[PDB]
Amino acid sequence: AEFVISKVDDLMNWARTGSIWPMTFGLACCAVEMMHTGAARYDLDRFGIIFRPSPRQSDCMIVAGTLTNKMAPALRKVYDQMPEPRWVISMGSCANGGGYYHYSYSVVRGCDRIVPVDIYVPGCPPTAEALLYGLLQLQKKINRRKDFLHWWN
C-alpha cells in the first residue's frame, strides 16, 4: 500500500538526518561558538554533522556572524553550488536577522535576504547547545520531508 512509501520516506529522511554535513559559513564569533559546537563537549561529529570546508558537497550551510553587504554575493555564490537537497541554518542574531547591526549600512538585515533559511538558531551568541538544538531542529525539518510521497503526488 502506501506503507512502503511511508517507510522509504522514513529511510531517505533517516539518511539525510543522520549525515548532514554543513558548509559552515563561520563569519565572526558565532563561528567560535560553532567551533565549540564542533568541539569536544557538544560533538557535532556525533550527530553525523561533518563541517565541510567546501560548498560542493554539503547538505547544510550554518551561516553565522554578521553577513556584511560585501560578503552577501559570496554567500549567495556559495549557496548556489550546494546539491539540491540543501538547507541553511542562520546562527546568531546578526546572521538570522538584522541583529546588533540591523541598522548598520554595511550589514544585510539577516541572511534571509540572500539565502532561503530553514532554521534560525536564536540568541546573538547562541549557547553551543542552542546551535546544537537548532541542528536538532533541522533534523526535524528533514524528518518532515517525505519526498517520495510527493514524487508520487
Partner: protein, 318 residues
Amino acid sequence: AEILGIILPLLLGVAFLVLAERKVMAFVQRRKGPDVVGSFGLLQPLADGLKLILKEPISPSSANFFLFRMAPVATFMLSLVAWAVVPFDYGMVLSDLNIGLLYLFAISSLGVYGIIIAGWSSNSKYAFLGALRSAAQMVSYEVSIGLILITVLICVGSCNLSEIVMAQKQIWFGIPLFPVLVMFFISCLAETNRAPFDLPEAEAELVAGYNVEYSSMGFALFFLGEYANMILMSGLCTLFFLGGWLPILDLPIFKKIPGSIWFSIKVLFFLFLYIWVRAAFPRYRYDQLMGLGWKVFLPLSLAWVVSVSGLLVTFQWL
C-alpha cells in the same frame, strides 16, 4: 565469481573505515565520534552513503561520460585488484602469483595514471596542478617503498606474498628490520595521501583538488578508493614486516590460532596507527615532504638494502 567475496567485504570495510577513522580520531580528541546514527554510529557509514546517493547533482553533465566518469572507476578498480595477491591466511590468497610483489608495484604504477587522469579531466588549473603534485608525491615515495620491499625481499626467497608471510615463521621482519617498518609505514602514509603527509589533502585543497564534477559518486569513490588503498597499504605493512597471518607461535590453550583473524588483528593495528598518526602530527607542506622522500627515505632505504644484503651475505643467512 569469488571476486564478490573480496570486493563486497572490502566495500563494507572501507565504508566502516570512514567511521573507524572518525571515531578513533575523535576518541583521541576526547570526544565520541559518530554515535547517534547507529547503536554506536555503526549505521553512520550507511547514512553517509545513502545521503550521497540521494543528493541531486549540481549539473547533470552526462555528456562527458567517457573521460572522467570512468577514471574514478579506474582508481577504485586498481585499489581493489591489488587485493587479489594479498593473502589473508595459508591458501587464502585469491591468486598466488609467483611474482606477486612486483604485481603490487605495477598496480601502484597504474594508480599514478588513475590520479593523473582524474586530475587532468578536472579543467581547473589549481586542481590539476594539485593532482599532479599528489601524483609526484605518490610516485616519489614509491622508489622508497620499492627499496623497502627489496629489503624484505632479500630476507625472503621470492616475491610470492604467501612466501613472504611464510618466511616469517621464525621471526617477523618487524623485529629485526623495525627501522624498515617505520620507513614502510611512513612511506605508505606518504604513498597514499592520508598522513601527516597530506598537503594536497589539506582539508580544503583536497575537495577542490580531485575533480570539478562531483555528483557525489565521484566524492564517495575517491574516498572509498583512498580508504581501500589505505586498507591495502596497511595489509602490506602486515604481510611483509608483521607476520602476515602468523601468531606469536606460543601455541596457547585458550587460542585455537585462526589465521585470517591474526591478519585482521594486525591490519587493524596498522589502520589504528594510520588514524592515531593522523590525529597527533602536523602536515608536512609538500615542500618538505618531497624533500623527505628523496633526501630521507631513499638514502635510509638504499642503506637498508645494502645492510640487510650484507649482513645476510657474510653470514650465509640467505
